[PDB]
Structure formats: structure tokens, C-alpha cells
Amino acid sequence: DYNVKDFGALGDGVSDDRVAIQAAIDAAHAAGGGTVYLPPGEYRVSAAGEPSDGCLTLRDNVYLAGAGMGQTVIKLVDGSAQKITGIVRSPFGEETSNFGMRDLTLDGNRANTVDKVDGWFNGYAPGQPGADRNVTIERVEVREMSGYGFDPHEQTINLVLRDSVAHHNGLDGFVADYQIGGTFENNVAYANDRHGFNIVTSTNDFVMRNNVAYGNGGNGLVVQRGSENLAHPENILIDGGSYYDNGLEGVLVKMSNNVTVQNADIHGNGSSGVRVYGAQGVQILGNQIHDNAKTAVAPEVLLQSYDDTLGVSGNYYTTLNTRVEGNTITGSANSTYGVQERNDGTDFSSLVGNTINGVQEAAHLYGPNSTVSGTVSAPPQ
Ligand SMILES: [Ca+2]
């Protein structure tokens, strides 16, 4: 057990406590590990150096703990004017293990600073073999970052990020970038200017259990390849939770495969509830998908192919083998179809046992091998 007071941290809302807190982290690390405690207070921090130096660098076996979200706050100094990749982060180009944070708030002070600031960052190095592992983040709030809220990054094995909140950030609340065997559980993302949750860059064997995303400018959740010619995300389970009142689709799956969205409540989004865009083997199971298309006419579920022939892969990604089963889909005034396929090569969809109401047509299919069975709809008046 280490206490940042013993290293000269003032926690007074004005003094720069970066050097004191980093000294407590380094002492815990040199001793073989420990928990660095921050008692209640606002702890101001400045940038440590170059963008990859963040503000504070955690190390192997070191955990930060505050007195509770909103009680312990680590906040960027007024007037900061440089890119900061993680107010708390792991070292760049090192495989860092058994570290994390709990019971505190990170505040990026976007109203009184400039340039891109991310709340949490960790990883090894883009394109390089190597992984951080056993990151545990519990009961953390990340707010007011001009960049990302939480950005666990390439590569991390066995992330646990639970019971946390990301809000009022300029990009995405939570990013899962090249995560392997990781979990987001019981998190909330709201009022971010882009996505609530963004799973990207080859993430695989990843669980999103009981997460909530609402009021974000982008998607509630997007699962996507990203901008580079990399292995697509695959083997992703979205289990339960709620994705509502977002600016774009509730849930977007783009150039990713073997993603399951199940038992979720998806409603009030600007465009479709669920969109599948150049994806294979997606399973949309047992969801309530209703009252979407709030911004303009759209189907509750859209299935379409992604034309990357002039992009980084050179490939045309048809959407194939989508299973849409056991959903209750209820359109509202702007909803066109319950499930729409574009006439773009999308094929091998199978609709099974959906309850579909409130739409112009339950299913609007084009694939020569796409099928629909067991749709339930209210009988005509
Ligand atoms: Ca690292």
C-alpha cells in the first residue's frame, strides 16, 4: 500500500501533482507491486513529455485506487496545449502486466485546454508482436476528454473493464483496439460526440456484457475493421444491454465476422437499430429492436455489402450467412422494413421466428439463397 500524500501530492485543485503521483507509482513498481492510493481531492496533472508519455505511466503490478468516482479526480491542468495519449497509460513499446485503476475519475478539462487528450491508454506498439495483459479497470469515470475516454489498445490480452462510465468525450467513450480475450461489463457510455463503444483493429474473443450506450453522436456500438488492411475483428459477443437514442445506428457491424448481438434493447436511434455492412456470420438473436429511424426513413435492420475495391484491401465484402432469429422488431413512423437486404450481393441471410410489426413490409430480401421462416405479426384489423 502506497499513498500519494507521502510523495508530496497536494490534491488541491491547482498544484501540479504529476511528479508526486508518478513517484508513488515508481516506488510501488520498484518494490514488486502495490496499490497507489489517492485520498479524496482533485489532483491536477500536466503532460509528462511527448504524446506517448501521457500524464501518468503505470507499471507492472501497480494499481491506482481512489476514494470513489467523483471523490478522487485526476484532472488535466488549465491551459494545456499538446496531444496527450492517456492521462493514465502503460509504457509504449513494453509488455506491461497486472495493472489498472479503480474508484476514481479522470477529467480531461476539454473546455479549458486544446489538442487531443485521451483518458486511459495502454498497449505495446501498432503492427508489432507484443501485448499488455491482465488490465483491470473497475468503477472509473472518464469525462471531458477531447479525444477518447477509455482506449485499451493494440495488443491487450485479458482486459477486464467493468462498472465504469465514459461521458462528454470528443470521440468515443470506450475503444477496444486489438483486444484478445477481453471483457467490457456493466459499463455506461453517454453524451460522447462520436461512438459509445468502438471495437476495432482485429479484436477477437471479446465479450460486451450488459453495457449501455445512449445519447452519443455516432453509434451506440460499432464493431469495425478500421482504416488499415488488417485481420477483421471476429468472435465478438454482445450480450444484453441497451443501445438507444444515438445519432447513427444503435449497433453497426462493419467488415467484421462472427459477431453475435443478443438479448439487447435497441431503440430510438437516428438510423437503423442494427446495420450489418460487409460482415460474415453475424447472428442477431433475441433482441428488442424498435422505434429507430428517428432522423430519416430507414429499416429497423439493414444488411448490406461493403465495397472496398478502391480501399486498402481491394476486396468486395459481401454480407453472408447472417442469422436473424427470435427478435421482436417494432417499427415506428419512419421505419420502412423490419429487415432489409440491399441488392448488392448480400446473400445467405436466414430469418427465423422473428416477431415483426409496425413496418411497411416485414422482410425485404434480395439474396438468391436468403430465407425467411416463422415471422409473427399482428393480424389485420
Ligand atoms: Ca505497455
Ligand SMILES: [Cl-]
Ligand atoms: Cl435502399
